[PDB]
Nucleic acid binder design. Sequence first.
RNA 1: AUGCGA
DNA 2: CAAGTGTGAGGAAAAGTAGTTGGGTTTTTTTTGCAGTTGAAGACA
DNA 3: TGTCTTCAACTGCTTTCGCATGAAGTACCTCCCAACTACTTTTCCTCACACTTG
Lengths: 52, 481, 57, 115
Amino acid sequence: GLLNLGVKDIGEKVIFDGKPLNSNSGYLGNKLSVSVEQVSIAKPMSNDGVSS
Amino acid sequence: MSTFIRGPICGTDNCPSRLWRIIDGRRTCQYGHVMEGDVEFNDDEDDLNGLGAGVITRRLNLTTNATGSFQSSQLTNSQLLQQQQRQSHKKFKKLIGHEAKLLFLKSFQFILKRQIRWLITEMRFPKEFEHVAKIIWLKILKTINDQPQEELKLQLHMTSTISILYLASTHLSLPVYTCDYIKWICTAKMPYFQASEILPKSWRIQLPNYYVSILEGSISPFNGQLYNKIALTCGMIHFKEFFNSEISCQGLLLKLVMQCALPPEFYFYTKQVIEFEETDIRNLTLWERTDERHTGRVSNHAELRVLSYFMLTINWMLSFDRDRQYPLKWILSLTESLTQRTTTSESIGRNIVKVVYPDKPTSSDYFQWSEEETLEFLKWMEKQFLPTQTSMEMTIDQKIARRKLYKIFPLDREDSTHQLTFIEDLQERYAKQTPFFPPARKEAIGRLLTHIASQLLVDFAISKEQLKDCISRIKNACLHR
Amino acid sequence: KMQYFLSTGNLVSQSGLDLQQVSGYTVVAEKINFYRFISHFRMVHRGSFFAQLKTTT
Amino acid sequence: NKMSPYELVQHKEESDEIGGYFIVNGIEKLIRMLIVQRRNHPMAIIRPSFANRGASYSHYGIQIRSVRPDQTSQTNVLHYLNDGQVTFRFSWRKNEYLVPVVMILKALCHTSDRE
RNA sequence: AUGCGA
DNA sequence: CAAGTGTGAGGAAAAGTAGTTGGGTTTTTTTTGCAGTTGAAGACA
DNA sequence: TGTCTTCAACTGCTTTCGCATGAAGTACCTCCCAACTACTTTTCCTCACACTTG
């Protein structure tokens, strides 16, 4: 479906804890890959008095 | 009353009433005349693009245009609300102390009375049973008031109530203790085990301040537990002076012989040994008011000794029946026939008492539970466990859910009178032995005695040795011929 | 957020979704008449920005 | 979506409910359809805004509205500058950027000028 | 402001 | 050999309150038309 | 030193009158509230070992 292709195209958003590790720093202080694999939509449901 | 004016009054005529003509835009005199204001403000046109973040917002501290001249209010401190909510969430109980004790007292008062009237219905023992029981506790109450001040050691206990009914019955001397206890458990005749009844709904809530909640059968009696409090009640009561012939009953002997190997002779045998050294030829009476808190081997629990003489008699009698009146093969036949068997109500009851799963003497019958015994058991659970009970709140939802669940498994039912009566069973086993006319017999005798030890002990606080401690005691008593 | 956008029709994002406007995308179904109801789903708009144009071409 | 008319009536609806709209806070709203440039196809346009971009801009230009499989679109413009220069228009973070088309050409694939 | 009666 | 005084702990339960987590408002602070005008780059005597 | 000429950036408006009267926005932040299960709190209840006697 269209929405899952969209989330496959946004790909990743990468962030480095600022390289630290004390080349440790320069060569990033580890990569933190992030993304969204699937997107599901569910039919309307309502549970009252919450769980249970 | 309050006054009028907290805004305007008509300074013309002294008429302190005000009209609103919303069509006019006018505040006017309700009774008399004129313009109370020509000015009228805030009913905007068709132009409220709403750019205004209008951060202000009323909050009742800047007053209000007072657009109601109708008023009465009152002086306020500043948003009752917290005091309002405190008052809504006030009516509960938040008591404790002497006041809580009085109703703890009261509730105890009531359940005992409910206990007594089922007493009358079951036994049909006229004004008499009823009034003696009433003054008995009147007497019990007398003592409680005296050591009051702030003394909150009222004993009672789940046990105290039946001790009360027990002593009152003995005054009258209608029955027995073991029989009464088994009957009561089997038919839940007593309201004893659950304390929700009363008509407390409210007493329940009176945050019975620690007291009341402790009501409700809390648990089933151990070894002593129940003969001990009877003694305390007697000491409380000074019962022996007050009431005649306590602990007595030639009826417990009958109950006991029929209990099993009912021998048209062992009633008189044991009655005779009782005659013998059993309190010098005298119906043993209710032990005394064991005032002391240590409650030691009072042992003069009359019955406890009756059962002891009963047991003793059997083996003495049977293991020196020189004339050989009781055949070798006869003794095991009795113990034989004895093996389990249904019960026109009684044995089913004794199973129900066995199921207090105590010292594992009946635990296994737990396991075995002779087929139907299994069945008439589930029958008595679907009838007498229902009271069982009635989540309050926690969703008028889950209540619903629970109901649905019950509906789902609907349980129950998705010559007659099979369970013959008591004297029927009794008859048929004395017939089952009706063929009457060394190391092995000694063994058989011991075998049989262990069985009765099971039976008599099982109705009662046992002491898989006090029993015999008891046994030991009179053993010693006896040899002073 | 999507109830937000669907309740105002002010679709806003850091890309502008390649659309010339940030309002007007959503309309009340206005069931006052079955004709009106069916007509909304056969209505097509050239977009508000051309409503702003002064010409008529 | 899949209820037969009879069931639909059993669910308190107009036996024919077309749907396609949204109930948001109880008010039925549908998204108005919009007419946009045909995707994926170069459309030759003369526009005086193109002259409004600055010096050396002609009117002439190509506009293709590329839409991704997911249907998000990205419009790409070519401008013929009066000087013969060709510039490539695109939009990112709703900001405009201009690049020489010969740059995106040598950037896409290794090639010769004669290619 | 969006849709609409005149 | 044995019977009787002195006394501190072991045990049960409903209602309230603890720990851990989550939900949840509340809370707060990309040109599309016109006509005129100023400042500019460039130029002159 | 003194005066002139062209172009590009900035200013103000281009239907009238009213209904549905206005509505709920929404980034960044969070302290308070409702929940499920387990743990803790207050009053009350009942029995035992030891030291000394016969």
